[PDB]
Amino acid sequence: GKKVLIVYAHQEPKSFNGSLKNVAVDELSRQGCTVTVSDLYAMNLEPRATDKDITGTLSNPEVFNYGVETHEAYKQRSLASDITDEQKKVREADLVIFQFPLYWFSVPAILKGWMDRVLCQGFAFDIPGFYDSGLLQGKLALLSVTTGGTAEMYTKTGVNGDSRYFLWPLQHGTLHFCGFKVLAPQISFAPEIASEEERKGMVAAWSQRLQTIWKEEPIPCTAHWHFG
């Protein structure tokens, strides 16, 4: 069998993002996959990296060190329940799909917070123990991104540069760092200015792609892919 986690970051269920998430649930479920959705806004996910992320502290340390404390907390199974619930979903997933609108050439802050807090030292990677040696090796990940800008704007000659450029910290610095193999991104450009028919086509294209997702080869998640 195959298990899929969709990490979804949009406020509005009727949005284009919400439609992309729903068609992924519907297609993957039809195939007989196990599917789970983390709807970050609906969960009111905490994005801040704070001492609340470590449970069971009787007396605060004089000096708070988020990196040291969360690494230790992971090993002691004393992370906050929201984090460990997400970690269980990741641990079990064969494929993690991130569904989000592009915000400032990156993920919305609530999703950045999921990355910062969930993908902790000892769980997702170790030092050393990263990139191909990351702890989530054997899993796949995919970014499904929507944009304001058109595909042409996101070319090397366009004002926003190649779309691949902004993908580097996400695909490579985050997903590959943790040991994921990365499937090619699904970028749905400029739905807001698209016709109704074009919008429906972008949704259908995603659904169609998912029919054969388990047959895809990952990208070579290298500097050449992103910048060459």
Place this chain on the structure above:
Amino acid sequence: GKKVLIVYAHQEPKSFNGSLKNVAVDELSRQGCTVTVSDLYAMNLEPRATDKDITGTLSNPEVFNYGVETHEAYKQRSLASDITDEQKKVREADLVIFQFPLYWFSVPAILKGWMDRVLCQGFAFDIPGFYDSGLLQGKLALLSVTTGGTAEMYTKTGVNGDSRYFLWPLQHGTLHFCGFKVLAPQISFAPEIASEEERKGMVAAWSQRLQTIWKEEPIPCTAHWHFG
């Protein structure tokens, strides 16, 4: 006269980041600059983009569109006061310094949320009115970033690749997009493994740089600079 805003994202006042922020306040204050610090964790800054960002009644209360609602709220002077307070500090600043530890090759989520929520359409940019025509034109911005990884790890052939690569979404996609001129980044590598005196040297180097900050030329914030 000159006005400086430091947008600071670290949980711990005794941290290396805290020392870099404090030396910036000390040196810029000595020069006679007006200095303000936004201590995001101390302020418990909201990172999530939600309908709480608009005060009062929404334009469309049935289907929530963050971009539309915040642009209209900006125009109607109906944004939440945390956002408007930040916008006043930015509007008045000649230089905005971001002081943060690198988190997943980007800003911590709390700082990402500052960018997402404060730099709204109508305030920071318009369409048209972006890149060099952005609404924060005539201002400078600087990233002062600390890392886990060493300088060697941040070369083209190093394990994490060139540091410039992941600066793109921040420098270009955010700061240049809003009209800032970008000063060369201050990257303080691997303080945690440095000796005490090496750390003191990195703090002194930052203070020294600030002495002559107003004499610096911006970088050419191009794809070529980041990836060539």
